[PDB]
Amino acid sequence: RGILHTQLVMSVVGSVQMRTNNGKSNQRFRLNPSNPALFPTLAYEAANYDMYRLKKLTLRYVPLVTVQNSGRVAMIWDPDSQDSAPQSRQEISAYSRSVSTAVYEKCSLTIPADNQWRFVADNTTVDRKLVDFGQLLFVTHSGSDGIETGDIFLDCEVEFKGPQPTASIVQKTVIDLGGTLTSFEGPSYLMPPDAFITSSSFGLFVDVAGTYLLTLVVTCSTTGSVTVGGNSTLVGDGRAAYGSSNYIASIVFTSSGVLSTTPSVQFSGSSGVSRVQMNICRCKQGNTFIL
Amino acid sequence: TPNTSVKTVAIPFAKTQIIKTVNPPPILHTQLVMSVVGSVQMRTNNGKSNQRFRLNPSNPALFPTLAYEAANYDMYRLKKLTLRYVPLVTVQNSGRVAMIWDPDSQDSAPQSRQEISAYSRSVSTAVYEKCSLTIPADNQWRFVADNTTVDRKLVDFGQLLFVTHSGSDGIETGDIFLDCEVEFKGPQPTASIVQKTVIDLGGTLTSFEGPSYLMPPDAFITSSSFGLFVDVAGTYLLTLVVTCSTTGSVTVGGNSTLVGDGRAAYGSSNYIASIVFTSSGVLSTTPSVQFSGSSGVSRVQMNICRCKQGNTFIL
Amino acid sequence: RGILHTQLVMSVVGSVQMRTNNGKSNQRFRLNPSNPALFPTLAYEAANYDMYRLKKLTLRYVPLVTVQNSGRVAMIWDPDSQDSAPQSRQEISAYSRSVSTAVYEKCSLTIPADNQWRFVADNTTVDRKLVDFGQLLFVTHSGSDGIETGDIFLDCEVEFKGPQPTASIVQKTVIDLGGTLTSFEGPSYLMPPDAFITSSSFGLFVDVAGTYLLTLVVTCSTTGSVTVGGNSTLVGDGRAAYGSSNYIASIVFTSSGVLSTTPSVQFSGSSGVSRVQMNICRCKQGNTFIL
Amino acid sequence: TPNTSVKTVAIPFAKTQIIKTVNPPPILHTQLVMSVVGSVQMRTNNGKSNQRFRLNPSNPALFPTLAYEAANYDMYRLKKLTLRYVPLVTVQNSGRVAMIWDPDSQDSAPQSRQEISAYSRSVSTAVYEKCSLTIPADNQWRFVADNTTVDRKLVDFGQLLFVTHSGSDGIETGDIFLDCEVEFKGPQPTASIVQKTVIDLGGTLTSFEGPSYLMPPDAFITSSSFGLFVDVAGTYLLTLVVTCSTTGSVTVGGNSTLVGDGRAAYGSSNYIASIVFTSSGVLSTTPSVQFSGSSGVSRVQMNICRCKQGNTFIL
Amino acid sequence: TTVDRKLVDFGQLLFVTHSGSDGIETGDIFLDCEVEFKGPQPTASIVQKTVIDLGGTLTSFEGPSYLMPPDAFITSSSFGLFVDV
């Protein structure tokens, strides 16, 4: 028999109007084990292999808030991985596997598994449709806007066929003025609508809920302070440096996955930001820098 | 069969539990462990050390009564293990309490929201609603921790971690109970139930002679001051022996109060006191026993005994 | 068959930190019928006899507060009557008969009785251990500090062997400067840590929850007013007098047994208090003094 | 069998009860008695007299309908007696309501917390939670109270006391219901259902001719004023006959309102009025019927009849 | 510690020798028990507290019975204990 793995997926933040996978597109919750959002602990095993096959899948929304904040969390599975995110509130019952209850009460949803071996995404494939097992979509619509409602767990029995040299679990992203985040050599901790640069400032929203390690490489002309807040606190040893036209810093912070209308990591005060290069690693608290 | 099943849930109001003892024979044994103090940001074992709850019968936090019977034996098992968080609050206060068991006894604690859910064996419901966690047992015999070993991983059975976040700040939310059937194999004469802990400048606590009342992230020394954060909740008996150059005063902080006849004395380079205090184990950001006002503190040596309110000295 | 007697024992006041029998030592709840705390109505029958034997014993914590104040009331029986009060929170499960639930919910605890005749305490015995049936200990530890949580009832079937001329149910206590309450010729309405005198003032805390009658005899040099508040209200006819160096007053008040950080009966404004002599009787409301 | 039994209690939210009548025959009989007004300090029968609820069928407080049928008989029993406090409030308001039955009918009331619990037969739960008290019956036949006796201890079956404290101040907390199977032995012609009460200066009410609408701690006279605290909650018909020297006015206070055509007159040393008021029985610290402004009041004589809103005089 | 420890203990052992064979390891005494215990405490404080005044003897507090009152002597200038356990 296999081994179950309970894994944290989201911290569900409620909404008033209508909202999909909360701040993000219909790209986040792909059913591949090469996805840090749905698989925070199996992505390290998924870097060693190229074929997977799912056996048991349950979603387990567990509430956290007091029973005073009305809401409706829905959990939806697609067989596609390229269908668009749902548009209305009432385009929810038209899916195949769906559980939609109130915010304050726990749920469950079982997903029937196939028997086909599928590729583990270390790419840059064009068709995600034939690779993934499907999407997971999470919808909130009543109210109780800025409140951590609950959190969604996920249980798996994943087996892997033929191995591989390890896919490098360190991102590498580049921003230009007017550009977006563009990943390089994987994985997908950051999605492209997660950052912004100006002529003087810089910011990153991080919602995967881990403890990470940055290496800022920012091309500016003056120095700038680096503040960490909103979703994440410093494991406070953030040592930066200046020199030539580069700006180099290294940060250890612990995000919490919750949305906020403040960037998690923010760089301000400088002038003429042109490029920002990143590396994120998912480290632990012992990887700080002694003053 | 209509493909959508509407199920109704009636969330009533405050759920509580009522606990009676019988007790009968000359063995399940429920005990309190903590009172869960909710916090806003993120917190482990609620301000206590990163190593505190630790499955030996020679551990004062989990077994304040069995630790005396554990001194007369060497081997132990643990048969039945349940953790039975009981709420004390209505459905009005938000928050989350999680109960975690490690198979290690030397890991650290989260230090994230990521690590709370999938540890291996964890129950993470809300504050106002009851939990129940069971731990599967083994059949191995392990040493009772005497004459303290270093790698206490092959000795203990594991940790308990008790993580809360996103409260409901510092309120009596609930309390955690613990059940055991402990059996003991071949006996000792006894074990010395008096700690001996030593601090140097820049160092931490290093315990000798056992048991584990104080743990190394509980004390701090400076060139002129000294402090202990006793978080075990008993009534104790100290003997401060502090290598100073001047005299000083000893006050009793927030976690504890005197039985107010603490007699101390100065003399040679040593400074010797003897205090009887009663601690509560709740957090407070004051040292529970504080010695300040002196100069050139280098060593502090301790003896702690768990004595009642008649072992105080008399003016 | 016998006759049951439901009797009020405490008004349980919650606590934040850790607290035994709330303001008092491990002397209060001795299992003798010569104890006004555990036996407010059988102490009048216990003054006539010298041997007792208990038959049925139940404790019946009945709550009073709304279910918003978290707490933990514990009720503990000892077979000793000279063991010390428990030290920690977690030295509760190590007793023999114990029920510990939340503040807002009722409990029950039955105590198995013996068959030995034991002496009724009209003394000044050294060993209470062989006389009493045991202790009762009451512990509160979460929070909800200054709140009347509930009250503990107690049921008995007590039979008495050979009679006696009546033990005088009027206390007599003396305080000196720097001294404490020292009782004389019984009973035990007041315990020694229940009073304080200064060079100018005087106070008594009364937590047995009855209606009483004082005779203050205070040796001062000037007069002083007598205020009653905190736990008890005047049945308001308090007539005092002055004269020579004595100060004599007579008060009828009704305590409620609840703790408060104000003395129940307080005497202030005078100068050179040296001795205070008392007599307490447990009277009724008709024993006042007409103006 | 593990010596510690964890039992879970789910305290839901507001519990209520729903009461319907059927009624069928040409006999259990539920009635309201009070609406429990919680108080902060300590209070008996909620501001009413120390003697009010009193087990005769000739008592308007407990039997506003049977008192007319009780006039046609002499003996009575009481077979079934339940008291069934129904809450009207959520689990948010603290407090305590106790329900007490005495075998005496002439004792006083507490006047402490000591006397509430162990009276003989008492239920003392919280405000938000339901109670139920049953009273065991006898087989004796007792006189219906006519042509008022003095020692009404051998006549009545007992008292009801209804003590609240530590509220939740003056809020509609709950209400108290009362069930009876009353049977009557040999009949009278009738009984005169009109009180006659007389007050002198310094004295109290002394009732004649029955029944017990007003009770002696309900009225006060001065040299110049007069007041009644009617706490029975009906619609009545007064005839004030006050021995004065001057005229005066009559107002209707807080417990009651006019049917506003109260016609009075002066004349000789008497002063004669005739009022129709409708009282509610709730406390208020104003006299419900007040006569003030006169001089040298010596006697006040009364007649009260329980008349409906058509027995008012006309301007 | 109670005072009248007669209703508490089960008795004494006395172990009298005479007319020796002076201070020689002669023999040794063994003791057998089946002890059973009824209802439990938290613990008992296993640390003595004994106090001597001038002219007085040992008066023990807080238990157990390591030292007993004919074991110590004080003077104006000296002090001694005969620990025999």
Ligand SMILES: [Ca+2]
């Ligand atoms: Ca590959």
Ligand SMILES: [Ca+2]
């Ligand atoms: Ca580990």
Ligand SMILES: [Ca+2]
């Ligand atoms: Ca006697």
Ligand SMILES: [Ca+2]
């Ligand atoms: Ca009576």
